[PDB]
Design a protein around this nucleic acid. Sequence first.
RNA 1: GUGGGAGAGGGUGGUGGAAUUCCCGGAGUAGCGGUGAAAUGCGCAGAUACCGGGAGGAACGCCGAUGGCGAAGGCAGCCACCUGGUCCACCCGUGACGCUGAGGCGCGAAAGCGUGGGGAGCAAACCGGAUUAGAUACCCGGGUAGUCCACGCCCUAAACGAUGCGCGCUAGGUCUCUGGGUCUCCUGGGGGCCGAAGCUAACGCGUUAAGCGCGCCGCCUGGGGAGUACGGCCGCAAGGC
Lengths: 73, 101, 117, 88
Amino acid sequence: PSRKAKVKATLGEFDLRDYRNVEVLKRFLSETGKILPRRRTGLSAKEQRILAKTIKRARILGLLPFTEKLVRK
Amino acid sequence: MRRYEVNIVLNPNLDQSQLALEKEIIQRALENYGARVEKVEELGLRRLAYPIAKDPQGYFLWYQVEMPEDRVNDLARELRIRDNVRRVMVVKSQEPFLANA
Amino acid sequence: KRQVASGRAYIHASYNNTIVTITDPDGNPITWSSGGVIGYKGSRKGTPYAAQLAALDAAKKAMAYGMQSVDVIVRGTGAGREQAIRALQASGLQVKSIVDDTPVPHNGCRPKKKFRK
Amino acid sequence: PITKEEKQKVIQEFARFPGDTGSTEVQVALLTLRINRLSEHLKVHKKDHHSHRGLLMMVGQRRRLLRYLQREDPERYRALIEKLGIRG
RNA sequence: GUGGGAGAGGGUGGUGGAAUUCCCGGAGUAGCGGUGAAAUGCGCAGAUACCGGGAGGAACGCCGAUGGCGAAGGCAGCCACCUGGUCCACCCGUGACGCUGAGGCGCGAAAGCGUGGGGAGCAAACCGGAUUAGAUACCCGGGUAGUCCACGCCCUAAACGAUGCGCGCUAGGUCUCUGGGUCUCCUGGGGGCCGAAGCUAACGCGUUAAGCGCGCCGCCUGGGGAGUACGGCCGCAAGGC
Ligand SMILES: NC[C@@H]1O[C@H](O[C@H]2[C@@H](O)[C@H](O[C@@H]3[C@@H](O)[C@H](N)C[C@H](N)[C@H]3O[C@H]3O[C@H](CO)[C@@H](O)[C@H](O)[C@H]3N)O[C@@H]2CO)[C@H](N)[C@@H](O)[C@@H]1O
Ligand SMILES: NC[C@@H]1O[C@H](O[C@H]2[C@@H](O)[C@H](O[C@@H]3[C@@H](O)[C@H](N)C[C@H](N)[C@H]3O[C@H]3O[C@H](CO)[C@@H](O)[C@H](O)[C@H]3N)O[C@@H]2CO)[C@H](N)[C@@H](O)[C@@H]1O
Ligand SMILES: [Mg+2]
Ligand SMILES: [Mg+2]
Ligand SMILES: [Mg+2]
Ligand SMILES: [Mg+2]
Ligand SMILES: [Mg+2]
Ligand SMILES: [Mg+2]
Ligand SMILES: [Mg+2]
Ligand SMILES: [Mg+2]
Ligand SMILES: [Mg+2]
Ligand SMILES: [Mg+2]
Ligand SMILES: [Mg+2]
Ligand SMILES: [Mg+2]
Ligand SMILES: [Mg+2]
Ligand SMILES: [Mg+2]
Ligand SMILES: [Mg+2]
Ligand SMILES: [Mg+2]
Ligand SMILES: [Mg+2]
Ligand SMILES: [Mg+2]
Ligand SMILES: [Mg+2]
Ligand SMILES: [Mg+2]
Ligand SMILES: [Mg+2]
Ligand SMILES: [Mg+2]
Ligand SMILES: [Mg+2]
Ligand SMILES: [Mg+2]
Ligand SMILES: [Mg+2]
Ligand SMILES: [Mg+2]
Ligand SMILES: [Mg+2]
Ligand SMILES: [Mg+2]
Ligand SMILES: [Mg+2]
Ligand SMILES: [Mg+2]
Ligand SMILES: [Mg+2]
Ligand SMILES: [Mg+2]
Ligand SMILES: [Mg+2]
Ligand SMILES: [Mg+2]
Ligand SMILES: [Mg+2]
Ligand SMILES: [Mg+2]
Ligand SMILES: [Mg+2]
Ligand SMILES: [Mg+2]
Ligand SMILES: [Mg+2]
């Protein structure tokens, strides 16, 4: 599936290397804390690769979750 | 010398005098390790994803800086000495990278 | 003799059994039940039916404490996981919410041979 | 690492004329630079082999260029070696 | 040379969360566990299930790929320091300085050896429970060396693309990683699929040749005996060549 929308489309211009922008990055995580695949994020190889890094940085800083409890269900 | 970003996270519970105390400790530790401070952003209290030392929030600090490379780790070590100091990270600065520019 | 009346329901579901524990909102257990607490002995504890009876026994013992509504928390993937939830669904309890808390490693610990591959 | 001013300095030192970049002398100077810097790195980190292979290859190229120089113009060979303080 | 680029390439020091186990506390009770089914086992000295606090060892989920890097072995949380390779653009410098490489030397997964630490989980041997005609096994409960770190040995392998290295030449189509360009397209470097000519015993290969050529290295000469004997060399030993 993943045709609901792509993440890249919903956001405007923004800095991938910026690990401190929470509202931008949170859009790239699932219900859980997981980093979405490209078919979700709609990013490129290079892009996705930098995203992974900066998301992890944000995590260590405490701005982003490593994992999150699955609700509903 | 090279350009780094010093991210500091402190205890949300510090009063004013203790906060400025910690900040001055930071100024001094930076100067002594020879770090010239280019830009500073104090974000203060922010909610965190997970607790850090059982406290749900954290006090954020960002320092753009230029310092000798050899010293960096040492400085980092120094910064982590304080109890009030919760998290410390030091990043080589980078040109930004834009999607949908 | 507590009168909690609002609490958590932990469903721990393995392939070998199903354990319903019910606690106060701080997580401290009032009562619990399992497939083995129900009359079953052998493999049958890991049965959906066994899970149903476990859940209803637990829920009953809970309402005796005065329990009204629960927060369901499911750990483990096993048969009768969903049957446990569906059991509490109308137990005479309201189910306020369901969360899946099943623990996963970030890959730290080597599994038993049976689980490797 | 090696900053551009370090490079420029050793080039302007060993350049056969103004603007000489790739003559044998400058190539050997530069190789000697990276070599000695590497060897200093390998005093410590004695457990890093992947770099050590690099060192070997560098020595290879250098030895070959010095053999070439000794063949074509022995006087320049002696000059270069003396200046750099290698091979003996 | 200059200017740009991507990468789990390598070494050191820090560091982050999830999980397992163990310890303390709370709450709680009659089982937990495990299998085809059970049993051993654990549990009223209060386990299992739940919350909280703590300690430690190890491995890094999602990103993650038909992906990248490396000469190979191999390389995957994050950060900084150190460091090897490499590709593109400019067409600036040297002026054949090239290629290959017996021997030498260095590297070389796992297991194994020495010393000293470490030891959560897993686990050869082993101790039990099952199964079976028996079960020196598959299954279950335990569990030592080991797996981990440092230093030092060991030198093996389905160490595999079962395909030595370099260079030139011979249709294209398509997918992909990464440069540059006047960016629908052109142009490199890399990884894949189908396929011209051609090769091949066939399978298949096919600008990533197993095609057409040249240079150099290693190697083969029916099966068993046998990677054995002996000799030499290496090794602490196991043992290797
Ligand atoms: N992250 C540190 C790394 O440590 C490596 O090796 C180090 C680690 O193996 C180990 O560091 C400590 C150790 O002192 C202490 N006694 C126990 C602690 N658990 C270790 O830390 C490490 O343990 C293992 C690695 O074996 C990892 O799985 C774990 O994530 C990590 N925390 O001891 C070694 C010496 O410091 C390498 N030096 C290098 O990759 C890097 O510095
Ligand atoms: N491989 C290491 C990683 O390098 C990345 O960045 C690396 C590459 O992006 C960068 O490549 C540069 C290239 O830009 C520049 N134009 C030329 C330079 N020679 C290259 O560097 C390369 O060669 C040199 C030896 O000369 C090595 O020391 C170095 O490791 C290697 N990357 O060099 C960096 C250092 O290796 C990561 N950002 C860094 O965090 C990490 O250490
Ligand atoms: Mg059972
Ligand atoms: Mg060569
Ligand atoms: Mg790396
Ligand atoms: Mg833990
Ligand atoms: Mg207790
Ligand atoms: Mg007993
Ligand atoms: Mg706990
Ligand atoms: Mg290769
Ligand atoms: Mg750090
Ligand atoms: Mg000339
Ligand atoms: Mg050669
Ligand atoms: Mg020699
Ligand atoms: Mg080995
Ligand atoms: Mg080993
Ligand atoms: Mg020992
Ligand atoms: Mg075990
Ligand atoms: Mg066993
Ligand atoms: Mg047995
Ligand atoms: Mg039989
Ligand atoms: Mg028997
Ligand atoms: Mg040992
Ligand atoms: Mg060793
Ligand atoms: Mg293979
Ligand atoms: Mg191939
Ligand atoms: Mg290959
Ligand atoms: Mg472009
Ligand atoms: Mg490859
Ligand atoms: Mg044909
Ligand atoms: Mg085929
Ligand atoms: Mg083909
Ligand atoms: Mg191609
Ligand atoms: Mg052939
Ligand atoms: Mg032979
Ligand atoms: Mg042979
Ligand atoms: Mg014969
Ligand atoms: Mg014969
Ligand atoms: Mg043999
Ligand atoms: Mg012999
Ligand atoms: Mg001997």
